Structure 1
């Protein structure tokens, strides 16, 4: 699509003056190439990343695109649950010297999920908001744990000062026919978790998600409506 850029195997789309979507692809036998999206945020003189790519090599391509196109140091990455599309590239982040953060529960599940744990653990209050001392110097990133849904550990991120919030694999697009990979999902709590994400970021109008292009808030309510039928 127009204005998108491609570096190696990766596609980048600018969403706002300081925010880009990164997209990487992995051949899933019997589906074909599955896109996964994350975010890149320029926060003054540094960059913040949300989610790895599927693989280490793809994640290194993100970092080199950042070097070439933004030319600011990457201060930290937040990864949104312990599955390959979101944490497959941890080793590349660590090799590059980027501090990594994930839900404590993601870090605990990581070995069991075949992922490398982050260096730091985020913890959350009963209302879902990150405990701030666990997310030092996060700039505009506002991290929210909406409850179990796509996985028990899934987290979400709003970008303060912008219209954007990132639902990761929890949120599906508003035309979707299904909730995707439910293999690790909590079918009972999913709908409430989707709605909690919407209530956490009530003014966000651009909802970015792992497996579809950015959508409106319709993605949230549609996701929740689909999830209500799992119960």
Structure 2
């Protein structure tokens, strides 16, 4: 897992898909690592999630063009939080097409954060010059608006923060969470992607379909331990 900046790390999953980790500070959670994917095809790139701010995003945007040689033309945020659209204003200054759950659009609009330009309400298949990018909203989880991005041709699933990493014992940040739904939503994820080769969570190490089960448990536990 190479470093490309003092705060930005990259790992390669396939010839077309990459995952990055950007280290940032958050009042109340300290030094914390946020993930996002980068998908390439015929010199064009789609960016899923952006570091929490415009600076880290820009660095990341140039590394892509400089190292992978690709114009970043597409953006899809997991949900309305800082570690998903934190640098969208930058992307906008540079004419990037934005796509998102319609509820993510409404939430950013009323809190005066940059707004993506096209919402979907159930699913959106976005084409990066040929290669499909399937976005689905299967119910609330970590956040009411959270989606997952599926890659039919790489069997790679970007789960976002509704999925926790294998070493996580804590449910963590449930301030906008929809705990009532979270458990029904995870089942829908496992049922829809039995064959996923790679699964990337919003924070932490990636892996296989077992992060879905690991998370279903951390949550069920929380529903009981507090009930």
Same fold (TM over 0.5): yes
Q: Secondary structure at the match of 2:91?
A: helix
CA contact (8 A) 1:154 1:170 kept: yes
Q: List per-residue Cα deviations over 1:118-162 (Å, max 9, x = no partner).
A: 0111221xxxxx155xx4667331111120110110000111211
Mapped to 2, the partners of 1:4 and 1:72 lie a distance apart of 19
Q: List per-residue Cα deviations over 1:36-74 (Å, max 9, x = no partner).
A: 000001123311111111101111111101111111222
Match of 2:199 among 199, 204, 207: 207
Query: Closer, same or farther in 2 for the Cα pair 1:14/1:153, shift >3 Å?
Result: same
Alignment of 1:69-88 (within 5 A): 69-88=67-86
Match of 1:151 among 122, 143, 151: 143
Mapped to 2, the partners of 1:28 and 1:202 lie a distance apart of 34
Q: Secondary structure at the match of 1:167?
A: strand
Corresponding position of 2:94: 96
Q: Secondary structure at the match of 1:106?
A: helix
CA contact (8 A) 2:19 2:38 kept: yes
Structure 1, gaps ≥5 residues long: 125-129
Mapped to 1, the partners of 2:69 and 2:192 lie a distance apart of 32
Corresponding position of 2:210: 218
Corresponding position of 1:11: 9
Query: Closer, same or farther in 2 for the Cα pair 1:41/1:131, shift >3 Å?
Result: closer
Matched, 1:168 2:160: yes
Q: Secondary structure at the match of 1:188?
A: coil
Shift of 1:110: 1.0
Shift of 1:9: 2.8
Shift of 1:215: 1.8
CA contact (8 A) 1:192 1:224 kept: no
Match of 1:121 among 119, 123, 137: 119
CA contact (8 A) 1:22 1:62 kept: no
CA contact (8 A) 1:8 1:61 kept: no
Mapped to 1, the partners of 2:8 and 2:71 lie a distance apart of 19
- TM-score, structure 1 normalization: 0.89
Shift of 1:114: 5.2
Query: Closer, same or farther in 2 for the Cα pair 1:136/1:162, shift >3 Å?
Result: closer
Structure 2, gaps ≥5 residues long: none
How many residues are matched?
Answer: 222
Shift of 1:102: 1.1
- TM-score, structure 2 normalization: 0.90
Query: Closer, same or farther in 2 for the Cα pair 1:14/1:112, shift >3 Å?
Result: same
Query: Closer, same or farther in 2 for the Cα pair 1:36/1:122, shift >3 Å?
Result: same
Q: What RMSD, in angstroms, separates the aligned Cα atoms of the two structures?
A: 1.8
